[PDB]
């Protein structure tokens, strides 16, 4: 028998927040998916947008696993007691603002899920935002210090209303949201850094 | 039998701020209620409001209980010493700005109460704010990671004037406030998250 | 003869920043007095105002007293090492911006003083600020979690220059200040919470 | 011999950040000098200024001294590991914004230097900023909780250009800066607090 | 056996984040380079600019070195677990805002690399921003408390592209960027402080004639 006080106590005795949980030599698989909740500010001249989205993140950590046959197989743990992917938005022009409790969910099998709601300003193409076709703002999010051999980032291609949780009170509306995978190399070093290109096709409303 | 100093020592020895106090296997019953204090900024064009309010939060944590027959049955404790529910306004567009000292009240029977004054910005229906019927802006508050099996949220029952604490110097006024309970499920997972929907009907003040 | 180091060390070893220094079962008599130093942002439309003031607070904790016949009878101690009254401005719409070092003064007889300079925004009656009688903004401050039986606030009694330290460069001027005591209760609970109501009667200085 | 690691380690073990290094009974001698870097915002209507300046502070703490014959005679230390004068700008309307690494310099003789670049807003005379005479904003800096007997402040006795490190891109320019020594006293208590009055005579650079 | 955990563990036991890694007794060589990403607000009247850039910093700390013949030769460590140059922009009017996770890259040969994306506001010459030649904003970055005998800062002047990483959606375009090493002394004290003068020449896009 075991409770939540133990599941956490154990996570503390095993988790290494500062050490990436690289199973064997295989890189840590990190899935990234953004759920656009709102579009607060847009500047058709400076090409900047202020958005609110849930940055759904999922990865795995073996050392945190535990037998949940007689205890819960999931618990909410502060991200501070857990290693977290140093994901970053390459084209963000403001520090990320986390609007929610910074708590992740850990499953008895090492599965970890973190989904904070974030408000952030980005630098992207805002042209055509006031037309029927709308504009497309691409946001590149991927690890900042871990390359392909250490961390890998893949989106979540599937069926889902790109504006399922989008505020109906926004002055904008979402037309389409596609998230593809890609890599980023630099004119210095050979190693590339996997990322996810989230393409946001939105437009201003007009009755 | 003891003093406030002792009471505090035991709490810090038994309390587990990072572990939900799920008595048995049932969810923790958290009550939420919002006492609107002020309505500062409104924008019918962007549908954003800036509101000040007290977030009456109450729940139970039996592990904190102590003998109060001959000792104080109530003490003030830093929330950082107690487990606190991970509530979040769903339509909030700014993190909550706590205006008051982050102190909770704990009773001998383990009942906990925390009522901080908060100033937050929400995204909601502001249309009609300058009309006689006013606008109805709805705010949804509930746990962020704990579903219905772990935390249950319900509004506090207490029929009183909605603008009983509402500043008479605000540019707007409260026509009515109704706090209902609801559940939000996400297309992926069968877990439902309980929340409270506080609908604030307010308008701009006029004259004649 | 004890030095300032031995004095602090003794304070640190006996003071409990999270435990109210209650003697017996009598409330801790806290003194609150505001010294308005400046008045900046003002809006008669939104009924808000930016104000800078010294929140001269004082109370006692006899457990910290020491013999100063041949030693310093006062030291500057970091408020984080001491228990400080959890006071808040009920009608404030921004958290207090403490401009000065967060240091208190502990006196050999257990007396404690804390006088931080603060800039904060308030929602009060700003109407008439541009008239001869000016405007009258009232600020309510008091304990946020401790009720009358645990804490009691009483404004310092002494006729002082209401603008003794007020900035001459401010676009405004103070007509008069009245610090009256007051009590507040809620339609939920019996216990009351004492507070101080400071009435700042100020007006905009006329160039003619 | 002893490398930097040893010196820095020794300081961290003997530093008493909350106790004033008062040699004997004579107060701690603190020297302050403001080296203006820029004038960003100025409002003659509200008498406010936003400026950037290097607040050079100098004092001694013999306890930190060491033998630097065959070792480093100066090391950089975080001001958090050391005691620091609780200086305040009596007429500031915003808390100081330290823009530079909060590191100090500790010389082997126990001399401590702390020169942080700060941006802060003040409430002073701006009238004339647009004339050939220019405006004369006066800034009072001094200890906030230590009086003459515990802490003394004196401007660095020197004669250097008042615009040496002033930005050439600023819309304004400095006519002259005088750093006079002064003191303050409050109607209640006999103690006096030593300060420094920095008078900044500046004006807007005309279109020529 | 030595995985990432150990590499980090030992780094925490032999690393003093507040003690500058002065090998022998010579000064620490810090290489500073800026990679401009975007130019936001620009006020020609007040002469101020909001810029975004990656501050590529590189130096060596031997107390961190380790054998990498049969183990990882690189890891990511929080900058708080190690020593970092106290660089500062002398003409900054706002504290640096770090947008990206604050982690450094540590190689087994003691080599340390820190490249944070920073958003900072500066006071410089903005005149001519809306002209063909454009404006030239100079940003001075160097150590704040370590003089030339303790820290030497030299830019990594390598034949690269200046607007290589600059956002294409910015209202401005980079005409040229030059990073010249320099020193700053004061009419009070003998010590000289090394720095890097980064001159950014830019102008508004889409002008006429
Ligand atoms: O499954 N979901 O879509 N969940 C979800 N969307 C918004 C909030 N939320 C609950 C949740 C679930 C797990 C974690 Cl780590 N955080 C939050
Ligand atoms: O409405 N109330 O019941 N109480 C209340 N409103 C403002 C201050 N206050 C007292 C109080 C009591 C307990 C706690 Cl944890 N916080 C606040
Ligand atoms: O009015 N006073 O008596 N004192 C006073 N006003 C502003 C600063 N000051 C000195 C002081 C005295 C005591 C404490 Cl705890 N802090 C500061
Ligand atoms: O003497 N100075 O003017 N020094 C100086 N001006 C700008 C930077 N700098 C170096 C310095 C040296 C020592 C300390 Cl504690 N702080 C800063
Ligand atoms: O330009 N680069 O060489 N590298 C680079 N640009 C953006 C991210 N990145 C990789 C990186 C590598 C090492 C560190 Cl400490 N930070 C970042």
PDB file of N, CA and C and ligand atoms in Angstrom, chain B residues 35 54 56 103-105 113-115 165, chain C residues 144-145 186 188-189 193, ligand 2:
ATOM      1  N   UNK B  35     -15.767  38.112  -3.857  1.00  0.00           N
ATOM      2  CA  UNK B  35     -16.381  39.358  -3.371  1.00  0.00           C
ATOM      3  C   UNK B  35     -15.819  40.546  -4.163  1.00  0.00           C
ATOM      4  N   UNK B  54     -11.893  39.724  -3.668  1.00  0.00           N
ATOM      5  CA  UNK B  54     -11.427  38.827  -2.627  1.00  0.00           C
ATOM      6  C   UNK B  54     -11.830  37.436  -3.069  1.00  0.00           C
ATOM      7  N   UNK B  56     -12.503  34.242  -1.557  1.00  0.00           N
ATOM      8  CA  UNK B  56     -12.758  33.414  -0.374  1.00  0.00           C
ATOM      9  C   UNK B  56     -12.533  31.943  -0.676  1.00  0.00           C
ATOM     10  N   UNK B 103      -1.391  35.234   3.986  1.00  0.00           N
ATOM     11  CA  UNK B 103      -1.620  34.489   5.225  1.00  0.00           C
ATOM     12  C   UNK B 103      -2.990  33.796   5.264  1.00  0.00           C
ATOM     13  N   UNK B 104      -2.997  32.528   5.673  1.00  0.00           N
ATOM     14  CA  UNK B 104      -4.229  31.754   5.764  1.00  0.00           C
ATOM     15  C   UNK B 104      -4.633  31.569   7.214  1.00  0.00           C
ATOM     16  N   UNK B 105      -5.915  31.332   7.436  1.00  0.00           N
ATOM     17  CA  UNK B 105      -6.411  31.138   8.786  1.00  0.00           C
ATOM     18  C   UNK B 105      -6.709  29.646   8.946  1.00  0.00           C
ATOM     19  N   UNK B 113      -8.828  28.543   5.784  1.00  0.00           N
ATOM     20  CA  UNK B 113      -9.426  29.663   5.074  1.00  0.00           C
ATOM     21  C   UNK B 113      -8.366  30.659   4.573  1.00  0.00           C
ATOM     22  N   UNK B 114      -8.452  31.032   3.296  1.00  0.00           N
ATOM     23  CA  UNK B 114      -7.502  31.968   2.699  1.00  0.00           C
ATOM     24  C   UNK B 114      -8.290  32.900   1.788  1.00  0.00           C
ATOM     25  N   UNK B 115      -8.248  34.187   2.105  1.00  0.00           N
ATOM     26  CA  UNK B 115      -9.019  35.154   1.353  1.00  0.00           C
ATOM     27  C   UNK B 115      -8.178  36.343   0.956  1.00  0.00           C
ATOM     28  N   UNK B 165     -19.288  45.019  -0.623  1.00  0.00           N
ATOM     29  CA  UNK B 165     -17.927  45.497  -0.397  1.00  0.00           C
ATOM     30  C   UNK B 165     -17.416  46.276  -1.605  1.00  0.00           C
TER      31      UNK B 165
ATOM     32  N   UNK C 144      -5.044  42.073   8.343  1.00  0.00           N
ATOM     33  CA  UNK C 144      -5.798  41.368   7.332  1.00  0.00           C
ATOM     34  C   UNK C 144      -6.337  40.037   7.854  1.00  0.00           C
ATOM     35  N   UNK C 145      -5.622  39.405   8.780  1.00  0.00           N
ATOM     36  CA  UNK C 145      -6.091  38.126   9.300  1.00  0.00           C
ATOM     37  C   UNK C 145      -6.350  38.088  10.808  1.00  0.00           C
ATOM     38  N   UNK C 186     -17.969  41.335   9.249  1.00  0.00           N
ATOM     39  CA  UNK C 186     -18.514  40.825   7.997  1.00  0.00           C
ATOM     40  C   UNK C 186     -19.762  40.007   8.250  1.00  0.00           C
ATOM     41  N   UNK C 188     -20.619  37.256   7.925  1.00  0.00           N
ATOM     42  CA  UNK C 188     -20.253  35.842   7.878  1.00  0.00           C
ATOM     43  C   UNK C 188     -19.867  35.372   9.247  1.00  0.00           C
ATOM     44  N   UNK C 189     -19.023  36.203   9.830  1.00  0.00           N
ATOM     45  CA  UNK C 189     -18.390  35.930  11.081  1.00  0.00           C
ATOM     46  C   UNK C 189     -18.604  37.035  12.130  1.00  0.00           C
ATOM     47  N   UNK C 193     -12.552  43.202  12.987  1.00  0.00           N
ATOM     48  CA  UNK C 193     -11.176  43.530  12.669  1.00  0.00           C
ATOM     49  C   UNK C 193     -11.003  45.042  12.770  1.00  0.00           C
TER      50      UNK C 193
HETATM   51  O1  LIG F   2     -15.143  38.503   4.338  1.00  0.00           O
HETATM   52  N1  LIG F   2     -14.528  37.937   5.328  1.00  0.00           N
HETATM   53  O2  LIG F   2     -15.094  36.937   5.908  1.00  0.00           O
HETATM   54  N2  LIG F   2     -13.311  38.350   5.797  1.00  0.00           N
HETATM   55  C1  LIG F   2     -12.478  39.275   5.474  1.00  0.00           C
HETATM   56  N3  LIG F   2     -12.639  40.221   4.438  1.00  0.00           N
HETATM   57  C2  LIG F   2     -11.477  41.109   4.403  1.00  0.00           C
HETATM   58  C3  LIG F   2     -10.560  40.619   5.541  1.00  0.00           C
HETATM   59  N4  LIG F   2     -11.254  39.485   6.154  1.00  0.00           N
HETATM   60  C4  LIG F   2     -10.713  38.724   7.289  1.00  0.00           C
HETATM   61  C5  LIG F   2      -9.917  37.453   6.951  1.00  0.00           C
HETATM   62  C6  LIG F   2     -10.028  36.293   7.754  1.00  0.00           C
HETATM   63  C7  LIG F   2      -9.284  35.132   7.435  1.00  0.00           C
HETATM   64  C8  LIG F   2      -8.446  35.167   6.298  1.00  0.00           C
HETATM   65 CL1  LIG F   2      -7.517  33.762   5.883  1.00  0.00          CL
HETATM   66  N5  LIG F   2      -8.346  36.267   5.543  1.00  0.00           N
HETATM   67  C9  LIG F   2      -9.045  37.388   5.820  1.00  0.00           C
END
